[PDB]
């Protein structure tokens, strides 16, 4: 019943005291955070409190969309020796700091995601050459489907790959994806290995990567410029915004204190120093 | 990052008067705390005078106070340092640092200064 | 099949025979078939930090000595 | 009335009983007492084995030595208890297996010693590596130290043999080993053994994972890390030392899918 | 009950008089504005009045949006020595006359603001070079977040900074912001100092700026051109329109009579002359 | 969950079996969840300038001598 | 039930709170808890100022050093608290002023120290002089030592400078300073801090005087004297020393007749 938008408990008036009750004392040893209120130690007047936690509820903490990647595509001239670059990005929040740290506060979570795609383009060669408005395709290849090979092979016939066709110069594109985990919650951390090295086998085939699980494998996104070759080369970038919605979490962990290094929890040398200098005696 | 394009030294003799100009490149507005310095040849790298961008209030170093005056070109993002009465000991590699600010707190030495200037040296020749 | 709910009013205009007073409501209508597509209601519940703060088996009574 | 102390506790599971006089009460992690897999959240279809008493009993891991140079110690579950009688056995003979735990970290000094040990129960305790060139590379053997456990260190030392890398952990203490500030560690279920007050810690952890039941040999659920909050000093003594012993205990454990015995290359 | 759209009091018919009642006389000394109506002094007929104050109610007085700033951004070529200029403007109404004077009539106010952004662009070099439609980002960095450093650093990953992505050539952008004061009303004027100079301390650390308070600090706006470097330089300007809504005010002050000079109430020399010449005897 | 209010009619067309006469109403529906987002009703109240014009402790009776 | 000890007490007035674990309970002098001036016994006619919280708060006087040569210490009220924030201020700005007091004399050793301190609260504690030639001659400055207080002595030493006499007190300890046998002192409200049992003393004194309300600057109501009943010995240590600290607190204090500020020649 107590919703997020409820007023915090009104602080009671309390006067002088000389009793055997000891509020003030604890023994953090138990592990219990001593639960005192202002009125417990000092004298308080009555106060009708109006502040509510409404803007810090799990929902609101993740309520902002966030950049997750920068995918590069381009459409060079047909005369060019280099091949028309189509980008393929594996879907993982771990590619950028920002969302990851916000997600790390929790061991597990269930969240239906909403993706937004802002696509910006530009010329490269200093030619007063033109280019007609381009049309992009963002194809979601789920784990195991054939990943595109050429900017123009069959794979793009999207028989079943849910795709999006975005014309440039229009409002950014957006799609909703429900919770797609193979579990009951997405694992932000996986302690263990996929393969158990067996006693009657080669170490090679018995070896995997620590903290690498399928739990967080979700296929790739394929992006290409649909318009064919154009005399004047035009590169473009596709920024992907992810905003977790209908979110819920489990088990708090301490926030990441030193610069992240790679997909694991691992850290690099030099970066292991977070706090600064300050004196024990200077306020 | 803020850039502090300084200008422009020289070794004129005692009692002299030169000036240093330092730009905001940079976004001079409410942030930067344009300060002056001079590295006393390896001794040596003191803070001269420092101006507040937001209001134009100056403070000086007990050394320079009076002779040196800090000037401000608000609109064209430049902070000057009218280096007056240049005496032989006014020989040191000059600086221009600029930090951010406290909304209402005056720009002082203990406060700034995040960014660094070029370090254009002004020397005062002797007799 | 709408969803008429209320909005917690902050700054109150000088009105009450429209705005200000008479509890301001908003209407929502889900447009898609998949739950995954609805906009978050934000009308979420709260709980007591006890599952974290007071994880002690034998209920803690603040007034008394914590180790008896 | 009958002087029941929150210092005098008695834990009993299976054929073992651990009493204690200087306890700091006990913590039931997250406020959920362990329990058998429900039918609402059941998953695998075959009948589940419930070893009970044959498994629900206090096993004692090997004791460690607490000195001034002790930086910390760490143990994974069910890992550590992989050689513990039947629970050790039932662990290898199944694909799936969920289990709770009751960790009773004992360690006593005397009114003349001082210091503080924080027993933390980190869910999914992923530890950091030793090489600064290769991420998440640590090998299985190193990752699962068993009943002996591994230890924290005062400084990060990179693994420089790229010919034959050590592939082990190198957890730095103040960073709770996984690049996070220790001072915050207090968010996971825990208790502090402060020599002046108590001589044991008691955390009861209910199975916590992303699945209903999972592979034991593969994925470690819990992580018990013990770090010295306040260093150990005694008398006017240059070399004081008191031992710390962990006695863990599986609870409400159940396994599914009997097969042939798994023999993991532990070395 | 008396709403803004109510008819003003109908003026009554009143005839000749010869009494001891003195309407006409007062003594402004009391401080009370003598409250007479037309009928008090001169004879009036009955008049059914239809005019209503409906268009001068506090709401209506502020009901027009107003320019508050002009933010400059640009996207120069990658070959250029000068760095891609991104603008950062501190949010304060005080940057332009117009809205400020309208706001000064009141000592305090509470108003949920609505911002609108009109973005116009143009070329600079006289090259028949082209430019693809640009996409702008307007990121609200609230007090204390890391202010953008490069047009392309992490800061823009907007993990939590509420942002807006505006494509050029579309209807101006608009966002609503509720009352965000740290108080119970925004202070248009703050008499006093933030820091009290203490007797046992250095004047320096004891010194602040008169009339400078946190009450009116609200973070900055960061604007950048999302599209990467383009061969032909294109500058653009972002005008920000603020329209106070759901407004209420407190305590009337006299309107600003001499040209404003800076963020304070202060005035410069030369400008201290508002009224013109006129003769005491000439109508 | 609409807001059907009335509009004060100014210039009246030559109609009354639609426009002109029969009190003209308008409908409004709040589209967002935050109060801060609604459009100002403009249906505000008014007060008496007495809190400014007649700030005198002892109620002023216009007819009588103001200083008695 | 909930182990409430008569050793664990918590005093709270205004914005301060003094807890304690080794208390010997508390004494409410004469059995009257302090209270505001009643209308039956009211006297001065103007409205009384009741500073409350701005005055009803624990102030801590300066700490003393307890050694083998310590003969005793003494403090007057409201005197001692004449520099204590608002209560100090409200004291000078009035002609009249009644106030209660809660004296919490703290002082702890360790199970390895020994000795006994008797905290006495003598109403109207007139102390004796130093000259054997001139009676009741002691000067105001000497009479009101403020927060530092004065001390008892092992032997009476006459003031022999009759040219410029010291005009101070010379209170002899066994005579409770005012020519009476210490052993009887136990008649005034008091508590004994016996190092083996407790580490604090708590006396609550209700305003006691001949009038309903009186001048503070002039007439001292109470008198806190602390003498070492049993001398201080430690270990096999020749120079043991533990500090004693008095934290007094005005209660239900009220003042009448505001005027201009009184500046007493304190030196
Ligand atoms: C066409 C685009 C469709 C996008 C579908 C994206 C695939 C699902 C990605 C889910 C990301 C969830 C991150 C949590 C992972 C974890 O920590 O276990
Ligand atoms: C992305 C843009 C969000 C805009 C949010 C703007 C920050 C709030 C600005 C409030 C301006 C109120 C002016 C009154 C200040 C005063 O006089 O005290």
Minimum CA–CA partner of A134 in chain E: E132
Instruction: Give the SS3 label for residue G141.
Output: helix
The topology under which CATH files domain C1-68 is: Rhinovirus 14, subunit 4 (4.10.80)
Query: B1: Cβ–Cβ under 8 A, 6 or more apart, which residues?
Result: B115, E149, E150
Distance of residue E89 Cα from the nearest chain F Cα, in angstroms = 23
Q: From ligand 1's centre to the CA of A170, what distance in Å?
A: 25
CA-based nearest residue to D149, from D49, D243, D76, D251: D76
The radius of gyration of chain C's CA atoms, rounded to the nearest angstrom, is 22
Considering CB atoms only, which of F35, F37, F63 is closest to E21? F63
Q: How far is it, in rounded angstroms, from Cα C44 to Cα A58?
A: 9
Tell me the helices (H) and strands (E) count for chain B, helix number first. Answer: 0, 10
- What are the phi and psi torsion angles at E163 (to 5°)? -120, 170
* C59–G contact, CB cutoff 8 A: no
Considering CB atoms only, which of E35, E36, E59 is closest to F54? E35
Question: In this complex, do D264 and A197 lie within 8 Å of one another by their Cβ atoms?
Answer: yes
* C7–A contact, CB cutoff 8 A: no
Q: How far is it, in rounded angstroms, from Cα E262 to Cα E253?
A: 19
CA-based nearest residue to D193, from D152, D229, D224: D229
Q: Is the peptide bond before E61 cis (omega within 30 degrees of 0)?
A: no
Ligand that lies nearest to the alpha carbon of residue E99, given by its number in the listed order? 2
Tell me if G15 sits within 8 A of A42, measured CB to CB: yes
Query: E87: Cβ–Cβ under 8 A, 6 or more apart, which residues?
Result: B27, E71, E72, E73, E222, E223, E224, E238
DSSP alpha helix (H) spans, F1-68: 50-53
Minimum CA–CA partner of A22 in chain G: G10
Nearest CA to ligand 2 atom 5: E177
H or E element in which residue E186 lies: strand E186-187
Determine the straight-line distance between the first and last CA of chain F, rounded to whole angstroms: 58
Determine the straight-line distance between the first and last CA of chain B, rounded to whole angstroms: 42
Q: From ligand 1's centre to the CA of B103, what distance in Å?
A: 42
Minimum CA–CA partner of C64 in chain G: G2
The partner residues of G250 in beta bridges, in order of sequence, read G101
Q: How far is it, in rounded angstroms, from Cα D128 to Cα D118?
A: 20
- Which residues approach ligand 1 with their CB closer than 6 A? A 91, 93, 113, 115, 138, 140, 162, 175, 177, 180, 186-188, 215-216, 218, 221
Nearest CA to ligand 1 atom 2: A140
Considering CB atoms only, which of D7, D25, D30 is closest to C57? D25
Closest atom, ligand 2, to C-alpha of E189: 17
Q: How far is it, in rounded angstroms, from Cα D7 to Cα D113?
A: 19
- Which residues approach ligand 2 with their CB closer than 6 A? E 91, 93, 113, 115, 138, 140, 162, 175, 177, 180, 186-188, 215-216, 218, 221
Closest atom, ligand 2, to C-alpha of E142: 7
Q: Which two tokens stand for residue D223?
A: 């992580």
DSSP alpha helix (H) spans, chain C: 50-53
CA–CA distances in Å: residue B77 to residues B27, B57, E56, E95: 8, 15, 42, 17
> How crowded is the C-beta side of A155, counted as CA atoms within 13 Å?
21
Torsion sign, CA atoms A240, A246, A249, A254 = positive
Instruction: Give the SS3 label for residue C12.
Output: coil
- According to DSSP, the β-strands at D27-28 and D200-205 are parallel
Chains D+F touching (3+ CB pairs under 8 Å): no
Nearest CA to ligand 2 atom 11: E92
DSSP structure string for G103-117:
EEEE----TTEEEEE
Minimum CA–CA partner of E266 in chain B: B55
Q: Best residue in F33, F34, F39 to probe C by mutation, most C CBs within 10 Å?
A: F33
Tell me if D167 sits within 8 A of D130, measured CB to CB: yes
Domains of chain E in start order, with CATH, are 1-283 (2.60.120.20)
Residue position matching structure tokens 């991420």: D135
Closest atom, ligand 1, to C-alpha of A219: 7
Closest atom, ligand 2, to C-alpha of E111: 12
Q: How far is it, in rounded angstroms, from Cα D83 to Cα B20?
A: 77
* Residue G8 with chain C: CB contacts under 8 Å: 65
Question: In this complex, do F38 and C24 lie within 8 Å of one another by their Cβ atoms?
Answer: yes
Which subunits count as partners of chain E given 3+ CB pairs below 8 Å? A, B, C, F
Listed resolution, Å: 4.2
CA–CA distances in Å: residue A225 to residues A69, A146, A165, E102: 18, 19, 10, 51
Q: From ligand 1's centre to the CA of A242, what distance in Å?
A: 9
Residue position matching structure tokens 């506790």: D9
Tell me if G237 sits within 8 A of G114, measured CB to CB: no
- What are the phi and psi torsion angles at E7 (to 5°)? -70, 140
Query: D8: Cβ–Cβ under 8 A, 6 or more apart, which residues?
Result: D19, D20, D21, D23
- Cβ atoms within 10 A of the Cβ of E38, count? 12
Query: G199: Cβ–Cβ under 8 A, 6 or more apart, which residues?
Result: G20, G21, G22, G23, G106, G107, G108, G109, G193
Tell me if D264 sits within 8 A of D147, measured CB to CB: no
Query: D147: Cβ–Cβ under 8 A, 6 or more apart, which residues?
Result: D61, D62, D80, D81, D82, D83, D84
H or E element in which residue D140 lies: helix D140-143
Buried b (16+ CB within 10 A) or exposed e, G168-195: bbbbbbeebbeeeebeebeebbbbbbbb
Q: Best residue in E26, E58, E115, E242 to probe F by mutation, most F CBs within 10 Å?
A: E26
Minimum CA–CA partner of G2 in chain C: C64
DSSP structure string for chain A:
--BTTSBPPPBPPB--EEES--TT---GGGSPPP---HHHHS-B--B----BGGGSSHHHHH-S-EEEEEEEEEE--TT-SS----EEEE--GGGSHHHHHHHHTEEEEEEEEEEEEEEEEEE-SS-----PPPEEEEEEE-TTSPPP-STTSGGGG-SSS-EEEEETTSS-EEEEE----SSSSEES---B-SSPPBSSS-HHHH---TT--GGG---EEEEEE-S---SS-EEEEEEEEEEEEEEEEEEE---B-S---SSSS---TT---------TT--
Nearest CA to ligand 2 atom 9: E218
* Residue C9 with chain F: CB contacts under 8 Å: 35
CA-based nearest residue to D203, from D217, D190, D185, D214: D190
Question: In this complex, do C10 and E247 lie within 8 Å of one another by their Cβ atoms?
Answer: no
Tell me if B28 sits within 8 A of B77, measured CB to CB: yes
Buried b (16+ CB within 10 A) or exposed e, E245-281: bbbbbeeeeeebeeebeebeeeeeeeeeeeeeeeeee
Minimum CA–CA partner of E87 in chain B: B27
Considering CB atoms only, which of E31, E40, E246 is closest to F40? E246
* Residue E34 with chain F: CB contacts under 8 Å: 62, 66
Inter-chain contacts counted by CB atoms under 8 A, chains A and E: 79
In chain G, the largest separation of any two C-alpha atoms, in whole Å, equals 69
Considering CB atoms only, which of F1, F33, F38 is closest to C4? F1
Ligand that lies nearest to the alpha carbon of residue A250, given by its number in the listed order? 1
Ligand that lies nearest to the alpha carbon of residue A94, given by its number in the listed order? 1
Q: How far is it, in rounded angstroms, from Cα B120 to Cα C5?
A: 66
* Residue G5 with chain C: CB contacts under 8 Å: 65
Tell me if D62 sits within 8 A of D147, measured CB to CB: yes
Q: Which two tokens stand for residue G61?
A: 């006087």
Torsion sign, CA atoms D127, D130, D132, D134 = negative
CATH number of D1-267: 2.60.120.20
- Distance, C-alpha B5 to centroid of its chain: 12
Instruction: Give the SS3 label for residue E204.
Output: helix
Q: Best residue in E147, E209, E217 to probe B by mutation, most B CBs within 10 Å?
A: E209
Question: In this complex, do E32 and F56 lie within 8 Å of one another by their Cβ atoms?
Answer: yes
* Residue C36 with chain A: CB contacts under 8 Å: 112, 176-179, 246
């Amino acid at each position: 019943a107590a919703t997020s938008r409820d007023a915090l408990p009104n602080t009671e008036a309390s006067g002088p005291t000389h009793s055997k009750e000891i509020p003030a004392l604890t023994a953090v040893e138990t592990g219990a955070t001593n639960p005192l209120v202002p009125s417990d130690t000092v004298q308080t007047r009555h106060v009708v409190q109006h502040r509510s936690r409404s803007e810090s509820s799990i929902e609101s903490f993740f309520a902002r969309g966030a950049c997750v990647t920068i995918m590069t595509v381009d459409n060079p001239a047909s005369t060019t020796n280099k091949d028309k670059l189509f980008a393929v990005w594996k879907i993982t929040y771990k590619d950028t700091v920002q969302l990851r740290r916000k997600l790390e506060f929790f061991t597990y979570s269930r969240f239906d995601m909403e993706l937004t795609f802002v696509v910006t383009a530009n010329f490269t060669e200093t030619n007063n050459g033109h280019a007609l408005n381009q049309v992009y395709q963002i194809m979601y290849v789920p784990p195991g489907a054939p990943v595109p090979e050429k900017w123009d092979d069959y794979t793009w016939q999207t028989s079943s790959n849910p795709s999006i066709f975005y014309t440039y110069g229009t409002a950014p594109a957006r799609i909703s994806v429900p919770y797609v985990g193979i579990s009951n919650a997405y694992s932000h951390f996986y302690d263990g290995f996929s393969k158990v090295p067996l006693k009657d086998q080669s170490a090679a085939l018995g070896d995997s990567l620590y903290g690498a699980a399928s739990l967080n494998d979700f296929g790739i996104l394929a992006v290409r410029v649909v318009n064919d070759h154009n005399p004047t080369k035009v590169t473009s970038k596709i920024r992907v915004y992810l905003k977790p919605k209908h979110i819920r979490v489990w088990c708090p962990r301490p926030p990441r204190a030193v610069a992240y290094y790679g997909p694991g929890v691992d850290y690099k040398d030099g970066t292991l120093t977070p706090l600064s200098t300050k004196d024990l005696t200077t306020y | 990052q803020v850039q502090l394009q300084e200008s422009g030294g020289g070794s004129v003799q005692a009692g002299g008067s030169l000036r240093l100009s330092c730009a905001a490149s940079g976004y001079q507005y409410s942030l930067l705390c344009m300060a002056w310095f001079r590295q006393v040849l390896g001794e040596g790298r003191e803070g001269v005078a420092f101006i507040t961008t937001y209001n134009g209030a100056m403070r000086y170093a007990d050394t320079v106070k009076g002779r040196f005056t800090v000037s401000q070109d608000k609109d064209k993002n430049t902070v000057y340092l009218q280096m007056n009465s240049l005496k032989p000991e006014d020989t040191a590699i000059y600086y221009c640092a600029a930090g951010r600010w406290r909304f209402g707190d005056i720009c002082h030495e203990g406060s700034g200064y995040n960014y660094w200037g070029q370090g254009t040296q002004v020397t005062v020749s002797s007799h | 099949g709408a969803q008429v709910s209320s909005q917690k009013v902050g700054a109150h205009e000088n009105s009450n025979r429209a705005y200000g007073g008479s509890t301001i409501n908003y209407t929502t209508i889900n447009y898609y078939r998949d739950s995954a597509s609805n906009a978050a209601s934000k009308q979420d519940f709260s709980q007591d930090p006890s599952k974290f703060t007071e994880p002690i088996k034998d209920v803690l009574i603040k007034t008394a000595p914590m180790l008896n | 009335a009958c002087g029941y102390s929150d210092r005098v506790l008695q834990l009993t599971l299976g054929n073992s009983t651990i009493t204690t006089q200087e306890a700091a009460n006990s913590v039931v992690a997250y406020g959920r007492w362990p329990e058998y897999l429900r039918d609402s959240e059941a998953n695998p279809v075959d009948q589940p084995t419930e070893p009970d008493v044959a498994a629900c009993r206090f096993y004692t891991l090997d004791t460690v030595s607490w000195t001034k140079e002790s930086r910390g110690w760490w143990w994974k579950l069910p890992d550590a208890l992989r050689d513990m009688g039947l629970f050790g056995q039932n662990m290898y003979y199944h694909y799936l297996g969920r289990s709770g735990y009751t960790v009773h970290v004992q360690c006593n000094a005397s009114k003349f010693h001082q210091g503080a040990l924080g027993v933390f129960a980190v869910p999914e305790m992923c530890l950091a590596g030793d090489s600064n060139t290769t991420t998440m590379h640590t090998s299985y053997q190193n990752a699962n130290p068993g009943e002996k456990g591994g230890t924290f260190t005062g400084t990060f030392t990179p693994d420089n043999n790229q010919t034959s890398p050590a592939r082990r952990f190198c957890p730095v203490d103040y960073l709770l080993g996984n690049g996070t500030l220790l001072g915050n560690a207090f968010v996971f279920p825990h208790q502090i053994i402060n020599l002046r007050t108590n001589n044991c810690a008691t955390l009861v952890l209910p199975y916590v994972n992303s699945l209903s039941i999972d592979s034991m040999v593969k994925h470690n659920n819990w992580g018990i890390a013990i770090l010295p909050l306040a260093p150990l000093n005694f008398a006017s003594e240059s070399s004081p030392e008191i031992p710390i012993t962990l006695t863990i205990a599986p609870m409400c454990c159940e396994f599914n899918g009997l097969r042939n015995i798994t023999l993991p290359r532990l070395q």
